């Protein structure tokens, strides 16, 4: 009741200090005789508060007092605490934090003083509470278990129960997947790191990861459903896959096939948002940019002062004695509205409203932002933002929204009948033009980064991984597509390593890989297509790969060289008269020549001259003279 709760929800330092004083005295008196009941009481207390419709889940009660309780709990010793309550709090707390991250608000408005890091941000208010809960979970999972696994001891750990709990693991991993590159994401990442360290066996840690990677959103199945990856989660997986034993175990459980299957599938399931030659053509036909000046601002109240002065790009001087725009509230009016119509839809990212700094009493107490992508049907973005006492109103959309109109509903000031505003900015982007200024989460590259790490991290195992990765259908076609795509969080050289190591692990895929690079790279409504790329296009990456295939010494070398020469003859023959044959890359032809030259000077172990028959030579002469 105490922690569950116009007054502020806080209780103030004195009441909050009393609760800490109360809890501290309990702890001291119980320390020398029976501290386990106090910790159980705290965890039972925290569990009750965290359960659905509990204080934490509903955001009720004194936040300062709740955080102080959470801060107090983090300093307690949880030895000899029953495993039932620990699992209850971890389940409840992880569910709560997963709920918090999934239920994050659509808009974001902080004061200029606030400089905290958002929950969805790694490797750097309710956020502090959620982070405080996550710190608690980390402390609990590190507790050694007693002999019978019913109480904390004082070499198994609660992590095993957590890892053995599929629902708990799904929540944590799915929760971390909604984070992006100390905040809540750090807490999830630290907990997951803690789970891996304390896992009894590498299989215990890998199974939840593999289970998550084997399903889609909320454990769904389906052909094109794949799990959400993020840089923190991907970074964690790589740390999990850091050892040879873990990599061997990952391979043994179908992990390599899984990630390779996911890459093919996920690559089918994504459209490249990177700008392409269509965007360039728009540019040829002639950080965010303020579109408010271009818009027209109106109000539903017939008696409102015209607010166009608010849209002007140049704000008035901060000590101007008269608000650029003022609204006189009727005694029964709580909200005034300002509709900004833009000439065309823009990707709105922020809305800045400047209250009259000289008379802050007329600043609206709260602002309700509605956004209309079509500019006709307004839809509230979120609940009104409390704005009283703000010299500057910065409303950041966490997810940029297409908006052709923005309706600001400003609440009557607490202590004034007039609302005074200086400027309104609508910051954003256009579809194209000069004003159009986590890749792992939005592309399939995360799977390739996982695949590259598996192939390269431990050389002695490389072969096995390639053998497990080569069979999957359309893997090479997809990797070629990622090779020829604009940088999307993975540098081309790493993609080259994957393609080279896959193509070299057996002759059959080398012929397929050569054909993909030179002849036909397309996939062999759910099937992968990879129709987007021209056949036979050459780059620094493709040229290097072809050279690496040609000059690598192994049993298949001969066959690969044959294929190259075959493509040459085919190309020449086609020239004398499938796209790769019609438009042979000059760079690749020189690459074939360099392969031949360097093979001659390397003293290869196959009969290179026998492959160079006179008929092929005559073909080249006829071609060049043509």
């Amino acid at each position: 009741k105490f922690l569950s709760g116009q007054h502020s929800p806080q209780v103030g330092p004195t009441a909050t200090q009393a609760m800490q004083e109360f809890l501290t005295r309990l702890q001291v008196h119980l320390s020398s005789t029976c501290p386990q009941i106090f910790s159980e009481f705290l965890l039972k207390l925290i569990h009750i508060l965290s359960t659905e419709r509990g204080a934490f889940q509903t955001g009720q009660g004194p936040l300062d007092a709740q955080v102080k309780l959470l801060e107090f709990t983090l300093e307690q010793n949880f030895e000899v605490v029953s495993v039932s309550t620990i699992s209850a709090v971890i389940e409840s707390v992880t569910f709560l934090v997963h709920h918090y991250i999934t239920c994050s608000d659509k808009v974001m408005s902080r004061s200029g003083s606030d400089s905290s890091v958002g929950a969805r941000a790694c490797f750097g208010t309710r956020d502090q509470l959620m982070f405080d809960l996550l710190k608690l979970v980390n402390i609990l999972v590190q507790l050694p278990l007693s002999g019978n696994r019913e109480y904390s001891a004082r070499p198994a750990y609660v992590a095993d129960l957590v890892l053995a709990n599929q629902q708990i693991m799904s929540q944590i991993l799915s929760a971390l997947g909604l984070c992006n590159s100390i905040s809540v994401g750090d807490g999830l990442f630290t907990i997951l790191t803690t789970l891996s360290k304390k896992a009894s066996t590498v299989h215990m840690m890998l199974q939840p990861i593999l289970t998550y990677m084997a399903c889609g959103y909320m454990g769904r199945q389906g052909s094109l459903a794949t799990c959400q990856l993020s840089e923190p989660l991907l970074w964690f997986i790589l740390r999990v896959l850091d050892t040879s034993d873990a990599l061997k175990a990952f391979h043994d459980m179908g992990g390599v096939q899984l990630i390779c299957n996911n890459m093919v599938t996920s690559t089918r399931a994504i459209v490249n948002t990177a700008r392409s030659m269509v965007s360039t053509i728009m540019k040829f036909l002639d950080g965010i940019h303020n579109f408010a000046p271009l818009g027209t601002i109106t109000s539903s109240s017939p008696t409102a002062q015209p607010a166009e002065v608010l849209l002007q790009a140049t704000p008035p001087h901060r000590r101007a004695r008269s608000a650029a725009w003022s609204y006189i509230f009727l005694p029964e009016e709580a909200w005034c509205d300002l509709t900004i119509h833009l000439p065309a839809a823009v990707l709105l990212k922020e809305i800045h409203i400047q209250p009259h700094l000289a008379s802050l009493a007329t600043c609206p107490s709260s602002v309700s932002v509605e956004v209309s992508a079509d500019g006709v049907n307004m839809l509230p973005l979120s609940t009104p933002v409390v704005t009283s006492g703000l010299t500057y109103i910065k409303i950041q959309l966490v997810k940029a929204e297409v908006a052709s109109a923005v309706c600001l509903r400003l609440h009557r000031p607490r202590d004034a009948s007039t609302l005074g505003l200086s400027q309104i900015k609508l910051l954003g982007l256009t579809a194209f033009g000069t004003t159009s200024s986590d890749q792992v989460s939005k592309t399939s590259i995360g799977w390739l980064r996982l695949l590259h790490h598996c192939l390269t991290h431990i050389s002695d195992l490389e072969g096995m991984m390639a053998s497990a990765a080569a069979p999957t259908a359309n893997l090479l076609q997809t990797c070629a597509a990622l090779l020829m795509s604009p940088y999307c969080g993975m540098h081309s050289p790493n993609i080259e390593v994957v393609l080279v190591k896959i193509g070299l692990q057996s002759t059959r895929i080398g012929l397929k890989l050569i054909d993909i690079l030179l002849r036909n790279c397309a996939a062999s409504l759910n099937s992968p297509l990879l129709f987007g790329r021209l056949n036979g296009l050459s780059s620094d990456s493709t040229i290097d790969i072809l050279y690496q295939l040609g000059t690598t010494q192994d049993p298949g070398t001969k066959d690969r060289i044959q294929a190259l020469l075959k493509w040459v003859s085919d190309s020449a023959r086609v020239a004398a008269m499938e796209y790769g044959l019609l438009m042979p890359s000059p760079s690749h032809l020189h690459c074939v020549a360099a392969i031949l030259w360097h093979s001659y000077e390397l003293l290869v172990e196959y009969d290179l001259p026998a492959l160079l028959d006179q008929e092929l030579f005559e073909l080249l002469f006829n071609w060049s003279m043509s």
Binding site: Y217, M218, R220, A269, A274, V278, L347, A431, L530, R533
Partner: protein, 76 residues
């Protein structure tokens, strides 16, 4: 292998052609049931949309919605 910027124009051209013909082309004349289901799942499906990450970005989502609305309006 394809790009969202081209998708925007593909959607625009699709809608414009649909609304340009004398007997305006109806969405049923363009797609069959699996195709339309996939089309809508691009907008609303969780295999193509992951919350803050939408298939083709906000602009692609808006263009697809606008194309669907334009085709429907031509029908209606």
């Amino acid at each position: 292998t394809c790009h969202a910027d081209l998708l925007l124009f593909v959607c625009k051209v699709l809608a414009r052609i649909a609304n340009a013909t004398r007997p305006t082309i109806h969405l049923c004349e363009i797609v069959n049931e699996p195709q339309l289901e996939r089309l809508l799942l691009l907008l609303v499906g969780t295999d193509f949309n992951r919350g803050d990450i939408s298939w083709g970005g906000a602009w692609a989502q808006y263009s697809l919605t606008c194309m669907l609305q334009d085709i429907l309006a031509g029908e209606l």
